[PDB]
């Protein structure tokens, strides 16, 4: 077969070598390939008449993809994965320390070992295509840059900007690329090879010069000072619950403190003990089943013509609807709404997400009027005979969504789909009615729709399988990632998450303050605490849902008595108006949130505060880790890689645990099963641990067969 990297040397005296690997549709760079470059590399200096390389991707959409994850998760312990860095950091300098200049021409995603594959290299020219993106994702999977990219982008681009890149994993566009220091020069696609043979020819490159924020660092006291700054900075964000956070912000000061053999010695020793870290195995964990739910198409069935779509109801809901819709998959969208006003509001949202982008990003304006294009508001019929799916976003009342069901058979085509955005009403009950009701399914979206990359896909009984197709290849065009859960009260990412926050509540009515609740599971992993979690989405909002779930299930999601009738009655309805739990009038930019006292007098609080902060955290997740249990046990959940999924992008669930399930498989099933006994001994019998639960604590059994 032909190689994963082949080599032709021109007549100019400079040689380019094609990266096409003909397994995946990316280059993924496989620790195999080692011997491929090896070979190349003598070929290189076998005549001293070259003057340059030029590494080319010869793949339209990326240049290399990063790492073969794969070779980490078969590592057995932490000296074999210190041993894939080091041979990754051998070849690196092999091809550095070539005498000719060494230069990559990138198009497409350059990430992970890619990006160290060019930093080693002594030129870089890029393509300003917009799927051309540079950075080191490796933390993300709880690593490091394991090739040498600690040590040769502090020397490149800038410490300061450097650890931005490997502490947060961001992708950097040809534009901030090129700024930075990054890449040399961008070029459009169609002279990339010739404008890279070009930098080939010329003996040395640019001493570049170093940014004056960098030099203001520069010293001592400095450089031991941004560390501390940075240091500072971090723990606050990741609550010290990150290794890799606090070893990339060692072996990145060692290797600038020490020797250059040094540095790329406490890299790798950085890369193999996080790769056997359990921060580290849940972070891929989530890696791979984004992965598999990205493949998995929800049927077998071939999804339905999607050259259209209406939706049913305005304001900001139906705008966050009709902007991913138009401006992620691009599709042409329709709102109806009686309400005038909903229509403005549906396309003033539209108009104010764009109009972000247009200040200091990506800009190109008329790109946005082109954008809005797709975009269209009317308060009449016209427009929807032909729409391909429909997606209703109105008020949650039964008899109403019926009646938007019949309005859409007889008003649209006959294979139109009827995609609810309902989140307390059954779908079969909304589909009973249907002349069709085979193409009348769930499509539960969260508010915001932009910040929110988890949807729900609710078939009923009688959903047709090709309408399930259709709909998941819609989510994932909008760049949602879907799971597909059954027609029952609270579907599951709602569902879990009621007695998560009916226990914060609960503590909140036994003398705990706002401050400790919340920072108590924000150390724990969650971005938000629970209660400023019920501010943002709203007070009726996040509690609406409560007497669907107590008359479908019991006294467990029931909340305290009468806290949430008595905070609704005082028009408290969190951030939406600016009243209830954290006041929101501060003038202060970064002010420090603070809470509204007259919270405790309309709550009926009884205590004095008494309860530590695991605790606090603990009686939370054990009533949410319940739930999830029951859903897999139900068939809620087609496996507990939805589960996963569904709740670390659904309800902010801590990455570094892996999901519910894998915290639970990390704690033992039999173990969490005492912690919720003795919950239950001496707060109430909704810490009871659920009938699946017991019986996997009473043998042996996982979620995740695979065990480590």
């Known amino acids: 077969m032909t190689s994963a990297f082949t080599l032709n040397v021109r007549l100019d005296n400079i040689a380019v070598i094609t990266i096409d690997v003909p397994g995946e549709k990316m280059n993924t760079l496989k620790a195999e390939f080692a011997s491929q470059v090896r070979a190349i590399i003598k070929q290189l200096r076998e005549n001293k008449e070259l003057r340059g390389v030029v590494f080319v991707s010869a793949k339209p959409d990326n240049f290399i993809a990063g790492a073969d994850i794969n070779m ?33 021409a990138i198009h497409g995603a350059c990430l992970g070992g890619g990006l160290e594959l060019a930093l080693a290299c002594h030129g870089r020219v890029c393509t300003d295509d917009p799927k051309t993106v540079l950075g080191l994702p490796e933390v993300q999977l709880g690593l490091l840059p394991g090739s040498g990219g600690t040590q040769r982008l502090p020397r490149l681009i ?15 566009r040809a534009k901030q690329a090129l700024k930075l220091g990054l890449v040399d020069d961008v070029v459009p696609h169609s002279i990339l090879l010739e404008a890279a043979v070009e930098l080939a020819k010329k003996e040395r490159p640019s001493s570049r010069p170093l940014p004056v924020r960098e030099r203001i660092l520069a ?67 989530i890696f791979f089943a984004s992965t598999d739910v990205k493949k998995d198409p929800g049927s077998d069935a071939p999804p339905a013509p999607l050259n259209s779509v209406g939706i049913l109801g305005g304001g900001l809901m139906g705008g966050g609807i009709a902007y991913v819709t138009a401006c992620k998959a691009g599709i042409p969208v329709r709102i109806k709404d009686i309400n005038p006003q909903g229509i403005n509001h549906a396309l003033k949202y539209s108009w104010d997400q764009l109009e972000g982008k247009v200040r200091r990003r990506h800009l190109k304006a008329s790109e946005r009027d082109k954008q809005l294009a797709l975009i269209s508001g009317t308060t009449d019929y016209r427009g929807f005979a032909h729409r391909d799916l429909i997606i209703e976003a109105v008020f949650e009342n039964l008899e109403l969504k019926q ?25 079969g009950d909304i589909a009973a ?38 709909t998941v290849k819609l989510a994932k065009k909008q760049g949602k990632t879907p799971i597909v859960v059954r027609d029952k009260a609270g579907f599951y990412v709602n569902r879990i998450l009621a007695p998560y926050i009916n226990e914060a509540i609960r503590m909140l009515t036994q003398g705990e303050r706002v401050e400790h609740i919340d920072a108590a599971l924000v150390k724990f992993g969650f971005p938000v605490g629970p209660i400023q979690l019920l501010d943002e989405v709203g007070i009726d909002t996040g509690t609406k849902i409560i007497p669907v779930l107590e008359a479908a299930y019991g006294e467990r999601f029931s909340a305290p008595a009468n806290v949430v009738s008595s905070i609704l009655n005082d028009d408290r309805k969190g951030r939406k108006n600016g ?34 902060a695991p605790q606090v955290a603990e009686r939370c997740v054990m009533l949410m880790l319940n739930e999830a249990v029951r859903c897999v046990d139900e068939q809620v ?42 919950l239950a001994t001496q707060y109430g019998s909704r810490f009871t641990p659920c009938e699946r639960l017991v019986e996997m604590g009473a043998r042996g059994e996982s979620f995740w067969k695979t065990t480590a």
């Open 637 to 678: 959940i087609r496996s507990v890689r939805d589960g996963d999924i569904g709740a670390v992008f659904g309800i902010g669930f801590p990455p570094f645990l892996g999901g519910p399930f894998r915290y639970i498989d990390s704690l033992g099933a039999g173990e969490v099963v005492a912690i919720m006994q003795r």
């Open 403 to 427: 009646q938007m069901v019949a309005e859409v058979e007889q008003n649209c085509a006959a294979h139109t789909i009827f995609a609810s955005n309902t989140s307390s009403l059954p779908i």
């Open 219 to 285: 010293g001592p006291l400095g450089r031991a000072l941004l560390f501390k700054m940075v240091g500072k900075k971090t723990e606050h964000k990741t609550q010290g619950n990150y290794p890799a956070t606090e070893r990339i912000l060692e072996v990145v000061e060692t290797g600038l403190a020490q020797g250059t053999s040094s540095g790329y010695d406490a890299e790798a020793r950085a890369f193999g003990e996080l790769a056997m870290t359990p921060q580290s195995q849940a972070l891929r964990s």
């Open 72 to 104: 980490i998760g078969n590592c057995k312990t932490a000296q074999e994965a210190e041993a894939l860095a080091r041979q990754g950091q051998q070849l690196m300098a092999e091809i550095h320390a070539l005498p000719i200049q060494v230069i990559a």
């Open 433 to 470: 009615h249907a002349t069709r009701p085979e193409q009348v399914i769930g499509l539960h979206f969260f508010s915001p729709v932009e910040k929110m990359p988890l949807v729900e896909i609710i078939p009923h009984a009688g959903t047709s399988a090709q309408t399930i197709a259709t």
């Open 158 to 172: 800038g410490v300061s900007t450097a650890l931005e890149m490997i502490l947060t994993g961001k992708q950097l």
């Open 579 to 612: 009243r209830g739990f954290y006041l929101y009038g501060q003038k202060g930019r970064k002010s420090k949130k603070q809470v509204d006292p007259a919270i405790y007098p309309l709550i009926g609080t009884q205590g004095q505060g008494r309860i530590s």
